[PDB]
Amino acid sequence: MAFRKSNVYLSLVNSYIIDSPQPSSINYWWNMGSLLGLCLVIQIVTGIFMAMHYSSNIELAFSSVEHIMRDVHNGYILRYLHANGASFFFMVMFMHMAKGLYYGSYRSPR
Amino acid sequence: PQSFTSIARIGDYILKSPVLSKLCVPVANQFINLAGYKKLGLKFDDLIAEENPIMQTALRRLPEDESYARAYRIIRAHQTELTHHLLPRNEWIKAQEDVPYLLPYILEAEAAAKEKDELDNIEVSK
Amino acid sequence: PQSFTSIARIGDYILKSPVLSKLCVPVANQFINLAGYKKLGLKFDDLIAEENPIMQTALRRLPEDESYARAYRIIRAHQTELTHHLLPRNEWIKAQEDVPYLLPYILEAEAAAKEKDELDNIEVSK
Amino acid sequence: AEVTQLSNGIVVATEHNPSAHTASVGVVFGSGAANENPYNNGVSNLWKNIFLSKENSAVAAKEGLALSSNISRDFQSYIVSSLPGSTDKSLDFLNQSFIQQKANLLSSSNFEATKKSVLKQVQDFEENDHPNRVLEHLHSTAFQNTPLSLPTRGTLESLENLVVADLESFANNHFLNSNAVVVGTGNIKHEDLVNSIESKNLSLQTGTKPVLKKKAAFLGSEVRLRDDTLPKAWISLAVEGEPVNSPNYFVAKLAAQIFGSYNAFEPASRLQGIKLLDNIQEYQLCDNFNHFSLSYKDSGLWGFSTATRNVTMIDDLIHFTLKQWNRLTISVTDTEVERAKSLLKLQLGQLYESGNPVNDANLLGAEVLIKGSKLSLGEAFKKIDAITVKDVKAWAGKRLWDQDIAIAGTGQIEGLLDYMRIRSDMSMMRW
Amino acid sequence: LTVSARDAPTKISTLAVKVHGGSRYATKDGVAHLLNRFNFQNTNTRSALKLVRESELLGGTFKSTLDREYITLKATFLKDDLPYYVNALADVLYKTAFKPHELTESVLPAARYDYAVAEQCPVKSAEDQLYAITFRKGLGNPLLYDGVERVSLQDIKDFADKVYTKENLEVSGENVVEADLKRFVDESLLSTLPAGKSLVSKSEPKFFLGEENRVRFIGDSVAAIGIPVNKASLAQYEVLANYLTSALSELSGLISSAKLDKFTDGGLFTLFVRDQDSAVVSSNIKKIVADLKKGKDLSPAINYTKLKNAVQNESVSSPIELNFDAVKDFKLGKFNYVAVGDVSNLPYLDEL
Amino acid sequence: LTVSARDAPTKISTLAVKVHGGSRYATKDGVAHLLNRFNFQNTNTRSALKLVRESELLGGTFKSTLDREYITLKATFLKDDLPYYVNALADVLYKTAFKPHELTESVLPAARYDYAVAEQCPVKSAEDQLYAITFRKGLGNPLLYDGVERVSLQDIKDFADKVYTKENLEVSGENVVEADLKRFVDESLLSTLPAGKSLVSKSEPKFFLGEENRVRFIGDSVAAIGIPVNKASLAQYEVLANYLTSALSELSGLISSAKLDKFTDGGLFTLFVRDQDSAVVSSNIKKIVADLKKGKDLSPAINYTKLKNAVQNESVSSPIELNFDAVKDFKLGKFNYVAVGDVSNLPYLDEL
Ligand code: HEM
């Protein structure tokens, strides 16, 4: 058998991403789950790269966020990416939940 | 989740009454025409969600020609909705073609399961 | 990882030589007595790591009475080492009892695998 | 060794062999099932089976003649095996029964009985013979809407439209003197056959055959004939290979022989020198495969055809076969080529010089109909020995490496993935 | 050790060592099948893998074939490398390893596949039943191994020692120079094989007539008749087999198969009628037996069966050289009958 | 519709509706076995699950047994609920469902299990062979369904309409008040069954002698002799069966089993000699047939066989009441012979 099936971890990546049998007739509303995974990776990465500069004291919280917005190189990129990506995280989450409510993805197996 | 015996009971009561028939049957016919499953080549008993043991029982008990035809209608509806079109107007399921073919098998498996549960929970009169 | 053909080659050169036999065989007997696998009811051909295709081939080609005896010695060693004890000195493996029974099957499957590799990597003289 | 001569209307090709105890005289036409419509299909098959009729074969068997015919895509033959001293009787029977007095075989209640016979025979083919109809569907999709896709057996619904006028029209269009080669194998001399053709006036007709308006064009596609009540899952898979009289013809046959054929239950086919068996033997991916190189006058197929009961690991079988195909482009060794040279020489020597003069007659008629002369086996072995590793790599880079494949399968082929996932194996990412 | 060859100006040579060691001489049921499957496995010097991977580069293949009488070890190869294959067949006949792991991994799965293939075909089952009820312990041994008696590895070794002997085999090479072949058979291991007796018995093989057997089978239904023939009456049943196969006979549509098996002491005429439903097989074989008990004139089929026997006879190495000229009339006497399949609807022996 | 009952002062009654509808009256091969496995399935009124789950709480079970002649529908119960079981057997005979999903899910797997179990035993295989070569299309039908001919659902409905007829069955209650049983069988559906003809023929079953069959089988080896007997000669073969089973014979150590199957128009005396290796079976059955062709004095086994006949006869509802008094001597005449197993070492019929 193939190495993507015989390995310990590549069998997981294969059976979730590569050979995962999807029905042929699903539409672009089924893209929102992968989009939510993308939102989560965006949020976690921009969050770590701002936590390297943020200070959580009550005298330095707002001053440190403004330090990110002014002193940190491309820190405005990270802050606006984190904030508007959280808004987009919740947009795509409402679309995921609404397509679940619509197409009956909550019923007996699931 | 709603048992098919209950749907048959309520629908038979509506159909056996002369006032309820002439009041609600055209509403259901226009509802079925607006539902639009016939434009994809599906009869309604292809639409019933099969992921429950009563429906798995009825689908096991379906004869083979109906099974092969149902398989073709399901695959054809998947390909049709993949291409984001409908079937052409001569490939639509006609009204006289939309017969409940799975329904006696569903109702028989439902009566068997209800009788099995009722005998599982009996109380002998002593 | 070391091939049993290599061990047999070095060991046969040491055993056939009259100086090297009288020099190194008593040290090996003392090494085997200090290793103490016979104190758990084990021969050495049970100690070999069986998780390779050569050893799996040898254990498949091993006949049935040797297989059941080897299985009993392995389960007996597991129970003994579970109890953190030794076997009683009447039940220890004697030196005349520690005979290589799996060694010809190992060497035969090894020669077959080396021939298979040499034939997969030939260069025909043209 | 063989002599071909074009007499004043017709081409006589003999291959004398005085060690033989039989002699086969026949006529091979150059209109096989690629000269059909999709509507008269099977009319060459009906012509075969009314040449092999009971009423027609009793006349041969009273004289001591054996009738054998064959329908290919390019050619078709009508060969009459006899004893070596009885070949004037073979020419008299082939002249009277099939060429001149043709309207007696085509009577009604002989046509009807033979039509019922080949209807039963073609239906028995279509229900039971699974590797060969998978190769037939491979032709039908690899060459779809082109002459070379029509099944030589004939379909069940184009054999039911067929009447006696269709066989007569195929006869008057394709059984011509410019289209035929009269063939003699066994132990008859070339002067003897051409003298017996000059003696009795042997003329078929005078016309020229209809030119097909479209040449055969390979279209990468797949047909997926799944049938889950069958125990195995047969699948053929092929690229466009070389036609006959291509320069890369023997290189294509050699590269088909590099991966050879296989039978998982014959223990001497397990031990073969193919690197694909190191993959496909561990989980027993298949029961048998065989790589072919079908060559026709217009185009051809190069691929492999297999069968398996391991219907959940079809994708590993297809993936490992096609990753082995990429090795022809990138890293084919030398000993694979020398092994394929020796085995292709053995296969071609068993094929051409076997004991049967009927098969020699079919091969001879095909090769002198397409090329005009039969290539001898000494020159063919010289051509095989001329092939190097760079020739195989260049042919594989032309024909195999990242090219459109044609697939066909019946049985439990749900485990077979779709087209693009399989065609992504024809080229790897250089690893 | 009888060596023969027939030279030709071609490129492919086929060597064949024929031993009288088929199922007829089998001590246990199917030991000849197990030896035939045991033939080209590994030797004491060269392994079985090394044999295939050397002969593929040299350009020839091997094939061990089990008959009712012979075991034929055949090698097909390019002509210019004869001594490699003479020495290979010598090593196979003289020094086979006969390992228990070779029995339990290749030979017995191969024999199980062979028995499954022959078990799915009802005509082969009817032919084996017909052989076993015509001849009881001679030619009516089982052809393939099924496992109704345990055949151990020492039984296969003992059958090899009984059978592979120097007066029991005969080397025959098609498209081989006979002088080089007779030189290469010597200076080999065929000259070192034991000179045991020839197992060919020259007497008549003691048939039985009027026997009938019935087998229940799931699939097609066949009904088969079988007539044991002697040496003198071999030619008439040969022209009868090719007559009923041919288009001269009105019974040709009804008959699925009809063949005469030939040996050096007799033979067996077999006729098989095979269909899907049993009413067709019943009507067919009733008509065959009735129209054959009424006499037939086999004088049309003489020139046809000369050609058919020549076509068949150019393949084999030892022709029997039949007459076919003194055959005029046939009339069906006594015969053996087996019925495989839907066996409650097939006719019995007294109804034919 | 013959109602009989034998009252008793006990706690457990058994009811038995016996149809003349076993394998002997089967139109296809195995319809009787499939109807027998179709007996206590669901009806038009009461399901099969409701049948078991009511009859357990009332206190009795059901069992449908397929014989070579009858189909016995037995029902065992505490005494004071007889009309329930009378009406349940009535519902089973009159209105069974015969649903196709019941054929595929219950009846076919149960019959395949019965056939696998009786296939694993070579004694039942040889008994079926001995029947099928003594009488051909009558009692020599196959007992169980094996799938060699396609028995469909409609054929089971046709066979049940033929067999479940009012003049064909007999109601018999062990430990039942007979007047109450006759009152309860009337006012039920036994009286509304069709009054068809009885399938019991009153003629002799047209047996055959000297036949011999041979079945290969992996496992044990049995050899079986079998004699069809008539109505006047039933007691002699009864005392012979109990003589060879008994300790008076010197052949009881060799004989594995020996029994006479009695019918209303004849019987079959079947003797099986079974062992693991075929040489013991060969020596044993050669000694059996030799010392049976030499005469035996069956006079000592008479009082013993009166005892064993009363033992066997108290269970059944229909005694035949044999004589046992005029029986003096036995000498083996012609007989039918089957050999199952290592069939190339069990002897043939000539060697016995
Ligand atoms: C689950 C995904 C996440 C969501 C939905 C999320 C959401 C948010 C939101 C809405 C804000 C306020 C942004 C603003 O208005 O300025 C915020 C701020 C912040 N988040 Fe996250 N967050 C996520 C993940 C993370 C992670 C994992 C980290 C740490 C590693 C992180 C670190 C921060 C920090 C430091 C701030 C401070 C203010 C700023 O710089 O924006 N976030 N988060």
Side-chain angles (χ1 to χ4, degrees), chain A residues 40 43-44 47-48 50 54 65 79 82-83 86 89:
Chain A
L40 190 58
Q43 290 312 280
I44 288 176
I48 292 159
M50 293 177 316
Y54 173 82
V65 175
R79 203 265 204 173
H82 199 66
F89 200 6

PDB file of all heavy atoms in Angstrom, chain A residues 40 43-44 47-48 50 54 65 79 82-83 86 89, ligand 1:
ATOM      1  N   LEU A  40      -9.168  30.496  12.218  1.00  0.00           N
ATOM      2  CA  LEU A  40      -8.530  30.128  13.476  1.00  0.00           C
ATOM      3  C   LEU A  40      -7.013  30.179  13.370  1.00  0.00           C
ATOM      4  O   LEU A  40      -6.339  30.615  14.312  1.00  0.00           O
ATOM      5  CB  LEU A  40      -8.984  28.740  13.910  1.00  0.00           C
ATOM      6  CG  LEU A  40      -8.596  28.317  15.322  1.00  0.00           C
ATOM      7  CD1 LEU A  40      -9.136  29.299  16.330  1.00  0.00           C
ATOM      8  CD2 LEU A  40      -9.112  26.938  15.619  1.00  0.00           C
ATOM      9  N   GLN A  43      -6.107  33.893  13.421  1.00  0.00           N
ATOM     10  CA  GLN A  43      -6.255  34.455  14.758  1.00  0.00           C
ATOM     11  C   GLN A  43      -5.131  34.014  15.674  1.00  0.00           C
ATOM     12  O   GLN A  43      -4.557  34.838  16.388  1.00  0.00           O
ATOM     13  CB  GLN A  43      -7.594  34.051  15.363  1.00  0.00           C
ATOM     14  CG  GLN A  43      -8.826  34.673  14.755  1.00  0.00           C
ATOM     15  CD  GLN A  43      -8.711  36.153  14.580  1.00  0.00           C
ATOM     16  OE1 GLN A  43      -8.889  36.910  15.521  1.00  0.00           O
ATOM     17  NE2 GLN A  43      -8.422  36.583  13.362  1.00  0.00           N
ATOM     18  N   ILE A  44      -4.772  32.731  15.633  1.00  0.00           N
ATOM     19  CA  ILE A  44      -3.746  32.226  16.535  1.00  0.00           C
ATOM     20  C   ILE A  44      -2.376  32.787  16.168  1.00  0.00           C
ATOM     21  O   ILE A  44      -1.608  33.197  17.050  1.00  0.00           O
ATOM     22  CB  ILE A  44      -3.775  30.689  16.548  1.00  0.00           C
ATOM     23  CG1 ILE A  44      -5.017  30.217  17.297  1.00  0.00           C
ATOM     24  CG2 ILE A  44      -2.563  30.117  17.234  1.00  0.00           C
ATOM     25  CD1 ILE A  44      -5.211  28.746  17.294  1.00  0.00           C
ATOM     26  N   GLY A  47      -2.255  36.493  16.904  1.00  0.00           N
ATOM     27  CA  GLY A  47      -2.324  36.660  18.337  1.00  0.00           C
ATOM     28  C   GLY A  47      -1.005  36.403  19.026  1.00  0.00           C
ATOM     29  O   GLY A  47      -0.648  37.109  19.966  1.00  0.00           O
ATOM     30  N   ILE A  48      -0.272  35.382  18.585  1.00  0.00           N
ATOM     31  CA  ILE A  48       1.053  35.136  19.146  1.00  0.00           C
ATOM     32  C   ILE A  48       2.002  36.276  18.798  1.00  0.00           C
ATOM     33  O   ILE A  48       2.736  36.789  19.662  1.00  0.00           O
ATOM     34  CB  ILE A  48       1.581  33.780  18.652  1.00  0.00           C
ATOM     35  CG1 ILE A  48       0.755  32.655  19.256  1.00  0.00           C
ATOM     36  CG2 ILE A  48       3.036  33.606  18.994  1.00  0.00           C
ATOM     37  CD1 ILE A  48       0.851  31.385  18.495  1.00  0.00           C
ATOM     38  N   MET A  50       1.292  39.329  18.263  1.00  0.00           N
ATOM     39  CA  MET A  50       1.056  40.520  19.067  1.00  0.00           C
ATOM     40  C   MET A  50       1.265  40.296  20.553  1.00  0.00           C
ATOM     41  O   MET A  50       1.531  41.261  21.275  1.00  0.00           O
ATOM     42  CB  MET A  50      -0.355  41.045  18.867  1.00  0.00           C
ATOM     43  CG  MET A  50      -0.624  41.570  17.507  1.00  0.00           C
ATOM     44  SD  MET A  50      -2.334  42.056  17.409  1.00  0.00           S
ATOM     45  CE  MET A  50      -3.109  40.665  18.205  1.00  0.00           C
ATOM     46  N   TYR A  54       2.468  42.793  23.547  1.00  0.00           N
ATOM     47  CA  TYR A  54       1.389  43.302  24.381  1.00  0.00           C
ATOM     48  C   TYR A  54       1.739  43.138  25.852  1.00  0.00           C
ATOM     49  O   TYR A  54       2.371  42.151  26.237  1.00  0.00           O
ATOM     50  CB  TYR A  54       0.094  42.559  24.051  1.00  0.00           C
ATOM     51  CG  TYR A  54      -1.088  42.849  24.945  1.00  0.00           C
ATOM     52  CD1 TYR A  54      -1.873  43.971  24.743  1.00  0.00           C
ATOM     53  CD2 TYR A  54      -1.443  41.982  25.962  1.00  0.00           C
ATOM     54  CE1 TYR A  54      -2.962  44.229  25.543  1.00  0.00           C
ATOM     55  CE2 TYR A  54      -2.522  42.234  26.765  1.00  0.00           C
ATOM     56  CZ  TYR A  54      -3.279  43.354  26.552  1.00  0.00           C
ATOM     57  OH  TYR A  54      -4.358  43.601  27.354  1.00  0.00           O
ATOM     58  N   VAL A  65      -1.131  48.271  23.115  1.00  0.00           N
ATOM     59  CA  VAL A  65      -1.810  48.079  21.833  1.00  0.00           C
ATOM     60  C   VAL A  65      -1.480  49.228  20.891  1.00  0.00           C
ATOM     61  O   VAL A  65      -1.262  49.028  19.688  1.00  0.00           O
ATOM     62  CB  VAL A  65      -3.326  47.914  22.045  1.00  0.00           C
ATOM     63  CG1 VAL A  65      -4.064  47.841  20.729  1.00  0.00           C
ATOM     64  CG2 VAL A  65      -3.595  46.655  22.815  1.00  0.00           C
ATOM     65  N   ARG A  79      -2.598  43.873  14.064  1.00  0.00           N
ATOM     66  CA  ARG A  79      -3.729  44.241  14.909  1.00  0.00           C
ATOM     67  C   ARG A  79      -5.025  44.303  14.113  1.00  0.00           C
ATOM     68  O   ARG A  79      -6.055  43.780  14.560  1.00  0.00           O
ATOM     69  CB  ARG A  79      -3.441  45.566  15.603  1.00  0.00           C
ATOM     70  CG  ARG A  79      -4.215  45.804  16.884  1.00  0.00           C
ATOM     71  CD  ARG A  79      -5.462  46.615  16.622  1.00  0.00           C
ATOM     72  NE  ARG A  79      -5.934  47.324  17.797  1.00  0.00           N
ATOM     73  CZ  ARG A  79      -6.933  48.193  17.769  1.00  0.00           C
ATOM     74  NH1 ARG A  79      -7.551  48.446  16.626  1.00  0.00           N
ATOM     75  NH2 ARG A  79      -7.311  48.807  18.878  1.00  0.00           N
ATOM     76  N   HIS A  82      -5.976  40.720  13.213  1.00  0.00           N
ATOM     77  CA  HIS A  82      -6.575  40.022  14.348  1.00  0.00           C
ATOM     78  C   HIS A  82      -8.012  40.472  14.592  1.00  0.00           C
ATOM     79  O   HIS A  82      -8.919  39.641  14.722  1.00  0.00           O
ATOM     80  CB  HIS A  82      -5.715  40.268  15.581  1.00  0.00           C
ATOM     81  CG  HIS A  82      -5.934  39.294  16.689  1.00  0.00           C
ATOM     82  ND1 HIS A  82      -5.612  37.958  16.584  1.00  0.00           N
ATOM     83  CD2 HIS A  82      -6.415  39.466  17.936  1.00  0.00           C
ATOM     84  CE1 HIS A  82      -5.898  37.350  17.716  1.00  0.00           C
ATOM     85  NE2 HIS A  82      -6.385  38.240  18.562  1.00  0.00           N
ATOM     86  N   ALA A  83      -8.254  41.785  14.584  1.00  0.00           N
ATOM     87  CA  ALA A  83      -9.587  42.295  14.894  1.00  0.00           C
ATOM     88  C   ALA A  83     -10.591  41.989  13.785  1.00  0.00           C
ATOM     89  O   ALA A  83     -11.662  41.410  14.035  1.00  0.00           O
ATOM     90  CB  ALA A  83      -9.511  43.796  15.147  1.00  0.00           C
ATOM     91  N   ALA A  86     -11.302  38.392  13.496  1.00  0.00           N
ATOM     92  CA  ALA A  86     -12.278  37.907  14.463  1.00  0.00           C
ATOM     93  C   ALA A  86     -13.700  38.208  14.006  1.00  0.00           C
ATOM     94  O   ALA A  86     -14.602  37.372  14.167  1.00  0.00           O
ATOM     95  CB  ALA A  86     -12.005  38.516  15.827  1.00  0.00           C
ATOM     96  N   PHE A  89     -14.211  35.654  11.341  1.00  0.00           N
ATOM     97  CA  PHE A  89     -14.421  34.392  12.045  1.00  0.00           C
ATOM     98  C   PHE A  89     -15.874  34.237  12.445  1.00  0.00           C
ATOM     99  O   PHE A  89     -16.477  33.182  12.230  1.00  0.00           O
ATOM    100  CB  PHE A  89     -13.526  34.358  13.284  1.00  0.00           C
ATOM    101  CG  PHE A  89     -13.269  32.991  13.855  1.00  0.00           C
ATOM    102  CD1 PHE A  89     -13.702  31.842  13.233  1.00  0.00           C
ATOM    103  CD2 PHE A  89     -12.566  32.866  15.035  1.00  0.00           C
ATOM    104  CE1 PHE A  89     -13.437  30.600  13.773  1.00  0.00           C
ATOM    105  CE2 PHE A  89     -12.311  31.628  15.580  1.00  0.00           C
ATOM    106  CZ  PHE A  89     -12.746  30.499  14.948  1.00  0.00           C
TER     107      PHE A  89
HETATM  108  C1  HEM G   1     -10.059  31.979  18.846  1.00  0.00           C
HETATM  109  C2  HEM G   1      -9.470  32.924  18.128  1.00  0.00           C
HETATM  110  C3  HEM G   1      -9.354  34.310  18.603  1.00  0.00           C
HETATM  111  C4  HEM G   1     -10.324  35.254  18.598  1.00  0.00           C
HETATM  112  C5  HEM G   1     -11.738  35.058  18.117  1.00  0.00           C
HETATM  113  C6  HEM G   1      -9.755  36.434  19.135  1.00  0.00           C
HETATM  114  C7  HEM G   1     -10.512  37.597  19.278  1.00  0.00           C
HETATM  115  C8  HEM G   1      -9.950  38.788  19.662  1.00  0.00           C
HETATM  116  C9  HEM G   1     -10.542  40.055  19.548  1.00  0.00           C
HETATM  117  C10 HEM G   1     -11.887  40.375  18.995  1.00  0.00           C
HETATM  118  C11 HEM G   1      -9.674  40.957  20.016  1.00  0.00           C
HETATM  119  C12 HEM G   1      -9.883  42.432  20.077  1.00  0.00           C
HETATM  120  C13 HEM G   1      -9.293  43.025  18.798  1.00  0.00           C
HETATM  121  C14 HEM G   1      -9.469  44.511  18.771  1.00  0.00           C
HETATM  122  O1  HEM G   1     -10.614  44.996  18.714  1.00  0.00           O
HETATM  123  O2  HEM G   1      -8.466  45.254  18.803  1.00  0.00           O
HETATM  124  C15 HEM G   1      -8.538  40.267  20.444  1.00  0.00           C
HETATM  125  C16 HEM G   1      -7.456  40.874  20.992  1.00  0.00           C
HETATM  126  C17 HEM G   1      -6.278  40.212  21.249  1.00  0.00           C
HETATM  127  N1  HEM G   1      -6.012  38.908  21.039  1.00  0.00           N
HETATM  128 FE1  HEM G   1      -7.210  37.694  20.277  1.00  0.00          FE
HETATM  129  N2  HEM G   1      -8.473  36.219  19.466  1.00  0.00           N
HETATM  130  C18 HEM G   1      -8.147  34.962  19.152  1.00  0.00           C
HETATM  131  C19 HEM G   1      -6.937  34.296  19.311  1.00  0.00           C
HETATM  132  C20 HEM G   1      -5.876  34.871  19.989  1.00  0.00           C
HETATM  133  C21 HEM G   1      -4.791  34.166  20.516  1.00  0.00           C
HETATM  134  C22 HEM G   1      -4.599  32.672  20.411  1.00  0.00           C
HETATM  135  C23 HEM G   1      -3.958  35.099  21.116  1.00  0.00           C
HETATM  136  C24 HEM G   1      -2.688  34.906  21.848  1.00  0.00           C
HETATM  137  C25 HEM G   1      -1.641  34.212  21.421  1.00  0.00           C
HETATM  138  C26 HEM G   1      -4.575  36.355  20.953  1.00  0.00           C
HETATM  139  C27 HEM G   1      -4.030  37.519  21.413  1.00  0.00           C
HETATM  140  C28 HEM G   1      -4.752  38.703  21.423  1.00  0.00           C
HETATM  141  C29 HEM G   1      -4.183  39.934  21.961  1.00  0.00           C
HETATM  142  C30 HEM G   1      -2.801  40.112  22.503  1.00  0.00           C
HETATM  143  C31 HEM G   1      -5.107  40.889  21.845  1.00  0.00           C
HETATM  144  C32 HEM G   1      -4.859  42.301  22.332  1.00  0.00           C
HETATM  145  C33 HEM G   1      -5.309  43.520  21.521  1.00  0.00           C
HETATM  146  C34 HEM G   1      -4.818  43.468  20.113  1.00  0.00           C
HETATM  147  O3  HEM G   1      -3.599  43.581  19.908  1.00  0.00           O
HETATM  148  O4  HEM G   1      -5.623  43.322  19.173  1.00  0.00           O
HETATM  149  N3  HEM G   1      -5.746  36.200  20.272  1.00  0.00           N
HETATM  150  N4  HEM G   1      -8.719  38.944  20.215  1.00  0.00           N
END
